[PDB]
Amino acid sequence: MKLSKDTTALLKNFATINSGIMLKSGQFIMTRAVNGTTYAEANISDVIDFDVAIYDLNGFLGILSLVNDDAEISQSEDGNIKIADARSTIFWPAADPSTVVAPNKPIPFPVASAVTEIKAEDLQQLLRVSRGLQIDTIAITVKEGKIVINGFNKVEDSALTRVKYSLTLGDYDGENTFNFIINMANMKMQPGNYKLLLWAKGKQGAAKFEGEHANYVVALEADSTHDF
């Protein structure tokens, strides 16, 4: 099997969520954080033809950049990964599945309670500014008829009442109010535009980001509230 640069670029983004991954045969890849607060999934154009666990995904992808694009990836005789080039061969170790945290199945995200979106340059600003503004917590809420994202420094503001960054996502014409709180460490989506699906029921809740190439599911913090 071959891996195009569009697939390896996605796998590189998935490596920021989990250092390892479980590849299974088909045209679908997915991963989850070790603590289970972040999930990612994507349909790829390449075809995976065998199941293998990769402990150091980022190191595996770096080696793929050192061979030709038409290099063949197959399972070696001893059960590891064989990368055949024109005049060379690379052997990457196949991890034991017990050392890689992988999701048991793809996430069936329920019907969203509220639907919005975020533009690429807005998502880019939110991510890049969070380091300079010491923002580790965002809240997706409704303020004066609009869905906004407020950034907070949870260390110096446990009550989340000092807005350091505010981003207006769009209009919201619904009587339902909510304040979905997300840890900034879980905003691992690659650059681009995303359709934002917000779901909450009882003390459970999650947010789904639908992009052009992948989906991201992020758990909500316990301080989140909603009234439907």
Partner: peptide, 11 residues
Amino acid sequence: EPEGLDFLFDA
């Protein structure tokens, strides 16, 4: 009290 997405991984 659960922190992650276990309520969706198990369904």
